[PDB]
Amino acid sequence: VVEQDKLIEIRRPAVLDNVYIRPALGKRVPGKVEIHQNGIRYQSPLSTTQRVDVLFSNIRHLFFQPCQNEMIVIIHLHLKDPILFGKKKTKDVQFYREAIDEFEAEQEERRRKAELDRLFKSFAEKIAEAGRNEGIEVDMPIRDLGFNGVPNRSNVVIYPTTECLIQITEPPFLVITLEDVEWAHLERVQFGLKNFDLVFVFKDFTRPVVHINTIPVESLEDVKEFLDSSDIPFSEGPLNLNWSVIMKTVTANPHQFFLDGGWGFLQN
Ligand SMILES: [Ca+2]
């Protein structure tokens, strides 16, 4: 673990109350995030041992995700370097809250959503403002550019952001920083396809590739437009390739790999 400076305490700190943390520490408990001098602190009055400090200097990305009718509002921190987290470690920490006469009932559901969205949005801007000489901006998922896919087991929506491609609605969290990407390869694209798979190769060849599987064919051209828009070069093929073999070969002699034309072998 990379060493982190002590949090410097701040008058009363800006606060977001009644908030849960993911990944979860003991039992899941409601908590409280406070903005301080050089970072933020999470803690709960119901688990009085717990404390999670994150410095502005260790925040690579800050995301605000309003209720996209998954009945959850999220503020997400993608960290530069992982930090100790109970007896484990994490590179992502997020704070969330879930939603908990028909005319007036819907009035109230609407009010509750707007309330949570306002509280979380406001706090997110306060974090960016307080950590602004570290250059922090609030980034947000782009709803109309989202597409379905399976990066783990369950079908989830993956959203492009200004700098990233994320899935933070449910664990395991995915935050791909686009500038880290070397190449993308589209698998099982063939006449009559129902869905296809997307593979990300990173500029660091020791980093494992990321599979986003089972993307509906309705989203095939949209993903390509996304890749082009992100200046990520790509290829496509009918087969699922063995990336263990490929990345093993590449990491052994990357200089010869690029003298041989690099990822062009994926392009016929
Ligand atoms: Ca409703």
Automatic annotation (TrEMBL):
GO molecular function, one term: metal ion binding
This protein's UniProt keywords: Calcium, Chromosome, Coiled coil, DNA damage, DNA repair, DNA replication, Metal-binding, Nucleus, Transcription, Transcription regulation
Limits of the Histone chaperone RTT106/FACT complex subunit SPT16-like middle domain: 147-237
GO terms under biological process: DNA repair; DNA replication; nucleosome organization; regulation of gene expression; transcription elongation by RNA polymerase II
Subcellular location, record wording: Nucleus; Chromosome
Lipid biosynthesis is among the record's keywords: no
Protein name: FACT complex subunit
Organism: Chaetomium thermophilum (strain DSM 1495 / CBS 144.50 / IMI 039719)
Parent-record interval covered: 653 to 942 of 1029
